[PDB]
Design a protein around this ligand. Structure first.
Ligand SMILES: CCCCCCCCCCCCCCCCCC(=O)OC[C@H](COP(=O)([O-])OCC(O)COP(=O)([O-])OC[C@@H](COC(=O)CCCCCCCCCCCCCCCCC)OC(=O)CCCCCCCCCCCCCCCCC)OC(=O)CCCCCCCCCCCCCCCCC
Ligand SMILES: CCCCCCCCCCCCCCCCCC(=O)OC[C@H](COP(=O)([O-])OCC(O)COP(=O)([O-])OC[C@@H](COC(=O)CCCCCCCCCCCCCCCCC)OC(=O)CCCCCCCCCCCCCCCCC)OC(=O)CCCCCCCCCCCCCCCCC
Ligand SMILES: CCCCCCCCCCCCCCCCCC(=O)OC[C@H](COP(=O)([O-])OCC(O)COP(=O)([O-])OC[C@@H](COC(=O)CCCCCCCCCCCCCCCCC)OC(=O)CCCCCCCCCCCCCCCCC)OC(=O)CCCCCCCCCCCCCCCCC
Ligand SMILES: CCCCCCCCCCCCCCCCCC(=O)OC[C@H](COP(=O)([O-])OCC(O)COP(=O)([O-])OC[C@@H](COC(=O)CCCCCCCCCCCCCCCCC)OC(=O)CCCCCCCCCCCCCCCCC)OC(=O)CCCCCCCCCCCCCCCCC
Ligand SMILES: CCCCCCCCCCCCCCCCCC(=O)OC[C@H](COP(=O)([O-])OCC(O)COP(=O)([O-])OC[C@@H](COC(=O)CCCCCCCCCCCCCCCCC)OC(=O)CCCCCCCCCCCCCCCCC)OC(=O)CCCCCCCCCCCCCCCCC
Ligand SMILES: CCCCCCCCCCCCCCCCCC(=O)OC[C@H](COP(=O)([O-])OCC[N+](C)(C)C)OC(=O)CCCCCCCCCCCCCCCCC
Lengths: 175, 329, 98, 173, 41, 54, 49, 186, 209, 50, 37
């Protein structure tokens, strides 16, 4: 706020922040991942599926396309129940596909689940159904600031794209 | 001279007292004679040279043939209580780590993990020294009261007296164990921890693990006497306490069970995985071996002979190596 | 001797640590670079540089290229500010780069 | 008169002013509070504008928390807004902005928003992966399993010997 | 804080009770020794 | 030396690294390489000590 | 007197009005250097003392 | 018992890895197909038919009645009279602790890890036994990476589950500085 | 497994997705703030006694004569501030009936639990901003207090005070909710069912079950 | 003045909640007389002095 | 009962510790653009 007091304020804030989250400076990298990562993935290309499978080996798939037709409240509630639990395998990460299809479903899911930790959009030029189906959801996640865009070239290097995607999602995760 | 030295003199004086022989310095501060030979500096130094061993014998004799003193006992065990107080906590955390949540909080199920968990809170009340005062109070309790009522007594009587006092002061031990394993600051203090236990569970909740603490205490006392005596069978007794060590581990888990600090209850504690019964056995033995309790009041006749014999051997150094053997003295 | 020995030690320790960069942030228009550096007591100290001035210069001796820390994948990159005659050292590791 | 100090990010300042002026316009339609006049309004005090910001201070905070979305925070939007609302109300409960300029109120709110975002990120860049600390590497190294000796596990008649069985148990436990 | 008061009061009573027993036993022993000293003198 | 060597052999064996010294399996009793490395480490320094002292 | 150069003006003490000092985005960040600097500086001081 | 084939009447999307619940169901059914004998079910021409609903594939379990931050209640079990049994059982456990370790060591001597098999091929894809379900296996390095990530998640769960709203000190610092600046403005 | 069960329960509580606990469903979970008051009272008493002893003896220093009143005043001010903060009605838990038209609540006042029932949802109202509190000076039986309040307020016997001046020590850590005729403080740090909570605060009644 | 209003406001809420119908004036006027007198005499003394 | 000390891990850490200052030593002794003729 003030140039002269910025240094003193920053020092005091860093010391006090340790009380809320002890040893935050030593475990900062670990804290980037949330306790129950909930991911919403946009993209239906073959390359996108490969990246999803590689990046989400330890996550559980949630197919939201089966819920089409039901009302938004029921669809949101069913998704929330799916992604608000941990299996006996101790896999607390869930990534959803083909959902939400509209802002109403997106907002409803966020309220029930306190928001989605990540909303990953893989823009593949060889995909022409993701934009036509889930444009409203993408705009909502862009508004709320939870949207991460990772353009993929089909003729790119699979290893490099995976590494870049892993870094971006790790940075894009939210608690 | 008026604003720094007056406040700095005590620090220097305290520094010198630790690093200098107080008795020898006191002798040299008095100069002259009143009519008796041997008050000169040369004679005083010769006396002060042997006074180191004489004072050790007198201090040892006092701890055996005179009523025990709390300050003297604490001084003998100063390291175990003053500097390495946090070692007791990490040992307690390691013992109870089987049914704790530490493994999910950036820690491993090993002595290194227990050390890190304790040290993650710093060194002060929430860190290394958390529960240090309770450890001091507990030492001032049954371990000291037992010495008062069992001075110069046999092993059996010492075990009986110690068992009675440990039962009497046991609730303090349970509170200390809960504080040690309270890694999230759930309890604000000893009274707060005791109040929560009594409010939620009955008063009997504070006496969990008493009968397995008493048996382990009896084994420890037997081992302590053996090492004090210095007999060859001390190693056999060391194995005995190691075999009895899981009794202590069960005691810690029972104390730490039935509370938010633990993932298990009293019923589940008994049927815990048997591969972790000897949790921290080697750290416990090492710590006890290096810092075994120096209860001179309970030393038997053989131990007293050993200490006096050691002092006497050192006292023999004050003869001239090249003294001539003369026909007439 | 005590006064100047302490002064020389502290002042030169600061100079050694001065080159290394703790933090580097662009401006909104990417016209300036704000650099946080080590202070004499190990705290943060702020400085400002212009991106145009910043430049990575080759060694004066052409046989010393192989001896640069930049040869290693986890080495150090020496970027020189041509206006202030200062040096900025960056770890080559991608972990430290946006 | 102008130092070489990085200025606080001004990304959300227009949004904060727009929300604050709109709410104040609902109660003072003739106050002439507009976003286009931020450069000139910030130099005037609330007394000059005839606006009692103290009464509307809480409503402004609630509306700002619910309307503004910050993507630089490490917390989800619902948690970020709740934390921002709690943080701002506590700080502004003991601050009287009536006698000072509008800019101080806007700058103060912007400063709190940025500090909360930095604290959410643990005072580190959100776009930089960073390097693991010593504890993280140590825990990861310890967490790694032990492969053991595969030759002893190989199915062979020689591996049935007591000595070989003893070695396999000792090294592959 | 009724539970805390009871716990604190119970602890004080137990420690005080032990103190009385210790002093009473010490009083008896000192009285016997003092009588023996007087007879010896 | 025997204690250090035994400790080193066990620790690396646990991680899956075995020094390529001695035949992998015995010619007659089929004893594994690790067992003979321990035996050689225990006996050889003792024989050298006796030889050196004499 | 020395600042009053005959042919060339000395630079202005204040930054040019064109420059904008609004923070952008972080390029490089190695925060652990501060901890390393504190460790080395204190260690040498203790050793020097 | 390694190769098996499952057929889903459009109820399972195979374009993405199968869920943990789906794999658990597959393992639960193979264990019956093996122990209970087999009618030659599971081949490509005679696969296993499954109709999985949304609830089965997604819902984890039930019986979520655990009470957080609770203490076991005493004085109702007559601890004074019942402590004897616990002490006796504890003594038995301590006495048997060396014996169990010796027995376990003997079992290690007479047992080998390769004795048991944990690999199953489903729909032309290799899987390995995981807790109570299957886990996709593609490479040894990938499997070790997955184990490392699982260990990391278990290890840092509590640290990541920190209190967001425990900002009392931070708010106090901000208030003090702004109030001081406010005085300067005044 | 034990940790997974606890972790799942923690997640459910944080999201406020509890099931129907019999006749009523818990849709709110908050806690009050506790402050230290006895230490300040003891410190103030010690300063007061110490100041009296120094005056009686006359062997004190100028330094301590300056410091002791400041410490005593600081302790006294903190004691008053903490006492006011502790005695703030704070909403701890709130339950909703099956019909969705009635609400039961339990409130904490200086650590004392008070249960209120039969609260129609139509009467609930969350004050987004700073409301106004009416104070009746005629109720006061002290002439000096009544005169002082009237002089400061500058109004009639019934005086309306804006909550902005009171939020510093009244509702600084929460908002204000109207539970029918009474008003309670709703802390920000709470676990609640947001969908139901918002509607009931707005006054709308949720559907049955 | 603010403290008295808050104390009165808190007391009014509690008495309505518990149905006591009596305000706890002993708590509302905890030290009002002492504080008012102390300030008044101090101000009077300062006015006389300066 | 997780395993603790492992000599192979310790040796790797020792190698990393000894190799850590190599980059800084190289940078300090390396040439620069300036040619102070
Ligand atoms: C050194 C020179 C002088 C030497 C003197 C000689 C040595 C021996 C002296 C002994 C006597 C001292 C005087 C008396 C003290 C009395 C204390 C006392 O009463 O406290 C009680 C103690 C106080 O309660 P509490 O504060 O809530 O608990 C302690 C907290 O946990 C806090 O404990 P903690 O362990 O977590 O503490 C961590 C430690 C963190 O810091 C450290 O540990 C630092 C260590 C640094 C290294 C050491 C270097 C050497 C020493 C340096 C000394 C420098 C000076 C320090 C100055 C300190 C300020 C005075 O410090 C703290 O953070 C403490 C918190 C502050 C509040 C409480 C303490 C206030 C200060 C008092 C200090 C007294 C010490 C004197 C002795 C000297 C000790 C050194 O309470 C209990 O013990 C309650 C027990 C209840 C048990 C359960 C009961 C159940 C019911 C029982 C029923 C029975 C009947 C059943 C019947 C059945 C049928 C038959
Ligand atoms: C100078 C370097 C070191 C300095 C240390 C720091 C000192 C600083 C100052 C003091 C303050 C710090 C205090 C200590 C801090 C903790 C240090 C630490 O990290 O240590 C733990 C650290 C291990 O911790 P960890 O990595 O977390 O533990 C790994 C797992 O957690 C496993 O752990 P766990 O807790 O889960 O335990 C499970 C138990 C599970 O195992 C069992 O329980 C097996 C049970 C088998 C049952 C079979 C029953 C069969 C039937 C019965 C047959 C017999 C009886 C028949 C009777 C018939 C007639 C009645 O596992 C073990 O038994 C293995 C434990 C590790 C063994 C370490 C052995 C060290 C030997 C050292 C070399 C040899 C001695 C040289 C002496 C001369 C030196 C000049 O220990 C070490 O690595 C070694 C530490 C240094 C050793 C010191 C030497 C021992 C001194 C005391 C004993 C003396 C010998 C007595 C016997 C012989 C007399 C002639
Ligand atoms: C004074 C006594 C001191 C004793 C010290 C203690 C150590 C030695 C004795 C230990 C005995 C107990 C050990 C535990 C037993 C456990 C059971 C078990 O499974 O076995 C473990 C393991 C064998 O198990 P495995 O699974 O079958 O492993 C076989 C691998 O092939 C084996 O491969 P490797 O990995 O072990 O490597 C081969 C072996 C190297 O061994 C060789 O193959 C080298 C052969 C060199 C021959 C040099 C020319 C000799 C000319 C004639 C000598 C006549 C005697 C003169 C007497 C002079 C006065 C002392 O080791 C090395 O190459 C590295 C070591 C470097 C050489 C240092 C050897 C020093 C030996 C000192 C003791 C000598 C005792 C001789 C007794 C009388 C013999 C007549 O036992 C040993 O490794 C011990 C070997 C001891 C030497 C054996 C010599 C055999 C050749 C004899 C030739 C002459 C007679 C031929 C008669 C033919 C029939 C008509
Ligand atoms: C940190 C120390 C800083 C000292 C600054 C010195 C300034 C020198 C300027 C040189 C220019 C020429 C001036 C004329 C010649 C000066 C001769 C001289 O130096 O005479 C000193 C004169 C010599 O005394 P003496 O002959 O040895 O008589 C022994 C009697 O015991 C003495 O007892 P007495 O009752 O008869 O004492 C007479 C009292 C009578 O007073 C007077 O001299 C006249 C009235 C002056 C007003 C202040 C009176 C003290 C009230 C407490 C502090 C209020 C805060 C404001 C302080 C403003 C600076 C004075 O005079 C003083 O001692 C005045 C200074 C005492 C201050 C104590 C607190 C230390 C921190 C101060 C700075 C705080 C930051 C303020 C930021 C800005 C605020 C606007 O007094 C001193 O020795 C003062 C220094 C004492 C240092 C040790 C303090 C005790 C141990 C540490 C306790 C820490 C915890 C408690 C305190 C925490 C902080 C509040
Ligand atoms: C010859 C006769 C001898 C006879 C006796 C023989 C006894 C043998 C016993 C058996 C020993 C077996 C060997 C292995 C043992 C390992 C230890 C073990 O088992 O531990 C288990 C466990 C293993 O750790 P882990 O995390 O499970 O896994 C380890 C990783 O796997 C490991 O991987 P990592 O990546 O973590 O690596 C760790 C470390 C691996 O390496 C090591 O750590 C090995 C170190 C070897 C050297 C040790 C020398 C010192 C030894 C201690 C001396 C005193 C002992 C006293 C004994 C008692 C006497 C009564 O890696 C490194 O190498 C790191 C680089 C730095 C190394 C050191 C650099 C030294 C430089 C020196 C030159 C400086 C420049 C000078 C020039 C400039 C001018 C000055 O270790 C512990 O947890 C140890 C706990 C020890 C606690 C001690 C007590 C602490 C008390 C704190 C009190 C605080 C109070 C504060 C008061 C504040 C008041 C204000
Ligand atoms: C932010 C602050 C807000 C609060 C504002 C508070 C306003 C009131 C301020 C009062 C200041 C009092 C200062 C007292 C100084 C110490 C007096 C003392 O030691 O006396 C002890 C004496 C002697 O007591 P004794 O006999 O026990 O001796 C003790 C000796 N010493 C002090 C060394 C420990 O006691 C008295 O009887 C004193 C009575 C008079 C007290 C007031 C004296 C004021 C002197 C300074 C001002 C002088 C006038 C300045 C010009 C103004 C116009 C005239």
């Amino acid at each position: 706020m003030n140039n002269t007091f910025k240094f003193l304020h920053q020092v005091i804030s860093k010391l006090t922040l340790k009380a809320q989250v002890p040893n935050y400076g030593q475990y900062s990298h670990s804290l980037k991942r949330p306790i129950n990562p909930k991911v919403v993935v946009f993209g239906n290309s073959s390359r996108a599926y490969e990246l999803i499978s590689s990046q989400f080996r330890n996550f559980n798939h949630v197919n939201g396309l089966e819920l089409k037709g039901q009302e938004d409240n029921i669809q949101a509630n069913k998704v929330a129940q799916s992604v608000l639990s941990i299996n006996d395998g101790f896999q607390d990460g869930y990534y959803i596909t083909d959902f939400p299809q509209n802002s109403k479903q997106a907002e409803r899911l966020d309220l029930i689940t306190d928001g989605v930790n990540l909303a990953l959009y893989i823009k593949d030029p060889s995909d022409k159904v993701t934009v036509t189906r889930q444009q409203e959801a993408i705009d909502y996640y862009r508004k709320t600031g939870a949207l991460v865009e990772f353009e993929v070239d089909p003729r790119g290097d699979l290893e490099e794209q995976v590494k870049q995607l892993s870094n971006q999602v790790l940075n894009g995760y939210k608690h | 001279a008026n604003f720094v030295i007056p406040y700095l003199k005590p620090v220097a004086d305290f520094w010198n007292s630790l690093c200098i022989d107080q008795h020898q310095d006191s002798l040299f501060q008095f100069k002259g004679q009143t009519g008796s030979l041997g008050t000169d500096w040369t004679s005083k130094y010769l006396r002060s040279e042997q006074d180191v061993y004489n004072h050790k014998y007198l201090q040892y004799h006092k701890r055996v043939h005179e009523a025990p003193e709390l300050t003297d006992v604490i001084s003998d065990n100063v390291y175990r209580l003053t500097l390495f107080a946090g070692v007791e906590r990490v040992l307690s955390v390691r013992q109870a780590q089987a049914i704790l949540k530490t493994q999910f909080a950036g820690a491993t199920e090993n002595i290194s993990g227990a050390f890190q968990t304790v040290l993650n809170g710093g060194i002060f009340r929430r860190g290394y020294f958390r529960g240090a005062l309770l450890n001091l109070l507990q030492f001032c309790g049954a371990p000291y009261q037992s010495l008062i009522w069992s001075r110069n007594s046999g092993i059996t009587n010492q075990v009986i007296v110690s068992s009675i006092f440990e039962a009497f002061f046991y609730p303090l031990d349970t509170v200390k164990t809960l504080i040690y394993n309270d890694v999230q600051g759930k309890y604000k203090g000893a009274f707060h921890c005791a109040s929560q236990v009594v409010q939620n569970a009955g008063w009997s909740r504070l006496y969990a693990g008493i009968f397995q603490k008493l048996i382990f205490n009896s084994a420890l006392i037997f081992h302590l006497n053996q090492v004090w005596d210095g007999s060859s069978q001390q190693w056999a007794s060391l194995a005995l306490v190691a075999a009895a060590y899981p009794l202590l581990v069960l005691k810690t888990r029972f104390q730490v069970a039935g509370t938010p600090l633990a993932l298990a209850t009293s019923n589940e504690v008994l049927k815990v995985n048997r591969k972790t019964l000897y949790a921290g056995l080697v750290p416990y033995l090492i710590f006890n071996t290096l810092f075994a309790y120096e209860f001179a009041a309970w030393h038997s006749s053989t131990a007293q002979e050993r200490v006096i014999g050691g002092l006497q051997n050192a006292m023999k150094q004050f003869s001239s190596p090249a003294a001539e053997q003369v026909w007439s003295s | 001797v005590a006064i100047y020995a302490t002064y020389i030690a502290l002042s030169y320790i600061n100079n050694i640590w001065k080159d290394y960069v703790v933090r580097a942030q662009f401006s909104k228009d990417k016209e300036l670079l704000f650099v946080t550096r080590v202070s004499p007591f190990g705290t943060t100290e702020e400085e400002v540089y212009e991106v145009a001035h910043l430049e990575h210069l080759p060694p004066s001796v052409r046989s010393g290229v192989k001896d640069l820390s930049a040869q290693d994948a986890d080495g150090l990159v020496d970027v020189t500010c041509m206006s202030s005659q200062r040096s900025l050292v960056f770890y080559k590791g991608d972990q430290y780069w946006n | 008169n102008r130092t070489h100090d990085k200025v606080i990010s001004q990304t959300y300042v227009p949004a904060i002013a727009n929300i604050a002026f709109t709410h104040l316009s609902k109660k003072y339609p003739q106050a002439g509070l507009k976003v286009d006049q931020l450069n000139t309004l910030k130099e005037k005090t609330w007394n000059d504008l005839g606006v009692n910001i103290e009464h509307e201070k809480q409503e402004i905070l609630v509306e700002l928390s619910e309307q503004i979305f910050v993507k630089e925070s490490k917390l989800r939007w619902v948690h970020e807004q709740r934390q921002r609302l709690a943080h701002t109300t506590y700080v502004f409960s003991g601050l009287e902005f009536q006698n000072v300029k509008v800019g101080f109120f806007i700058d103060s709110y912007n400063f709190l928003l940025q500090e909360l975002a930095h604290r959410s990120n643990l005072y580190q860049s959100k776009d930089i992966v960073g390097e693991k600390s010593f504890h993280e590497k140590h825990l990861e190294q310890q967490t790694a399993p032990y492969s053991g000796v595969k030759s002893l596990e190989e199915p062979v008649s020689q591996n049935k010997s007591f000595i070989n069985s003893l070695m396999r148990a000792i090294h592959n436990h | 804080s009724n539970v805390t008061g009871k716990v604190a009061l119970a602890t004080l009573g137990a420690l005080t009770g032990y103190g009385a027993f210790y002093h009473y036993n010490q009083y008896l022993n000192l009285s016997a020794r003092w009588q023996q000293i007087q007879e010896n003198i | 030396f025997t204690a250090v060597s035994w400790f080193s052999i066990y620790q690396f064996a646990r991680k899956g690294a075995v020094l390529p010294v001695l035949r992998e399996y015995g010619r007659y009793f089929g004893t594994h390489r690790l067992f003979r490395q321990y035996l050689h480490t225990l006996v050889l320094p003792l024989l050298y000590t006796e030889y050196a002292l004499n | 007197n020395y600042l009053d150069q005959p042919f060339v003006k000395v630079p202005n003490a204040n930054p040019n009005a064109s420059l904008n000092f609004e923070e952008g985005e972080v390029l490089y960040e190695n925060t652990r250097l501060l901890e390393w600097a504190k460790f080395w500086n204190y260690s040498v001081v203790v050793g020097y003392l | 018992s390694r190769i098996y084939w499952f057929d889903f009447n459009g109820t399972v999307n195979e374009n993405l890895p199968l869920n943990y619940n789906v794999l658990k169901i597959c393992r639960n059914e193979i264990n019956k197909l093996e122990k209970l004998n087999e009618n030659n079910l599971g081949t490509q021409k005679n696969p296993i038919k499954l109709n999985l609903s949304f609830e089965d594939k997604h819902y984890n379990t039930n019986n979520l009645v655990l009470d957080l931050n609770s203490y076991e209640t005493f004085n109702s079990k007559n601890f004074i009279s019942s402590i004897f049994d616990k002490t006796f059982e504890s003594l038995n456990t301590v006495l048997m602790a060396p014996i169990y370790s010796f027995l376990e060591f003997k079992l290690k001597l007479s047992s080998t890890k390769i004795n048991t098999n944990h690999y199953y091929v489903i729909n032309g894809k290799l899987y390995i036994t995981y807790n109570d379900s299957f886990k996709l296996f593609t490479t040894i390095n990938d499997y070790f990476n997955d184990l490392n990530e699982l260990s990391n998640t278990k290890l840092f769960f509590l640290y990541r589950s920190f209190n967001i709203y425990n900002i009392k000190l931070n708010s106090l610092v901000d208030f003090v500085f702004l109030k001081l600046i406010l005085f300067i403005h005044l | 497994l034990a940790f997974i069960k606890e972790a799942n329960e923690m997640i459910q509580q944080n999201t406020g997705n509890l099931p129907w606990d019999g006749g009523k469903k818990k849709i709110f979970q908050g806690q009050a703030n506790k402050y230290l008051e006895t230490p300040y009272y003891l410190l103030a008493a010690l300063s007061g006694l110490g100041l009296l002893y120094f005056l009686y003896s006359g062997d004190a220093k100028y330094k301590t004569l300056v410091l002791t009143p400041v410490v005593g005043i600081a302790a006294f001010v903190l004691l008053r501030r903490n006492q006011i903060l502790n005695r703030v009605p704070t909403l701890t838990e709130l339950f909703l009936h099956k019909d969705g038209k009635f609400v039961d609540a339990v409130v904490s006042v200086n650590g004392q639990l008070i249960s209120k029932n039969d609260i129609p949802v139509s009467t609930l109202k969350l004050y987004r901003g700073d409301h106004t509190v009416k104070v009746n000076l005629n109720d006061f039986e002290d002439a000096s207090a009544k005169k002082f309040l009237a002089q400061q307020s500058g109004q009639e016997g019934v005086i309306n005070v804006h909550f902005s001046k009171l939020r510093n020590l009244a509702a600084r850590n929460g908002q204000v909710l109207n539970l029918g005729d009474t008003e309670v403080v709703v802390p920000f740090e709470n676990q609640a069912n947001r969908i139901i909570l918002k509607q009931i605060f707005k006054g709308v009644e949720v559907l049955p079950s | 003045y603010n403290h008295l209003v808050i104390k009165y406001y808190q007391s009014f809420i509690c008495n309505t909640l518990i149905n006591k119908k009596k305000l706890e004036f002993n708590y509302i006027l905890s030290s009002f007389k002492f504080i008012k007198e102390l300030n008044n005499i101090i101000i009077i003394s300062l006015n006389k002095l300066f | 009962s997780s395993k603790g000390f492992n000599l192979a891990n310790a040796v790797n850490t020792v190698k990393s510790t000894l190799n850590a200052p190599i980059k800084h030593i190289k940078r300090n002794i390396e040439p620069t653009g300036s040619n102070y003729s």
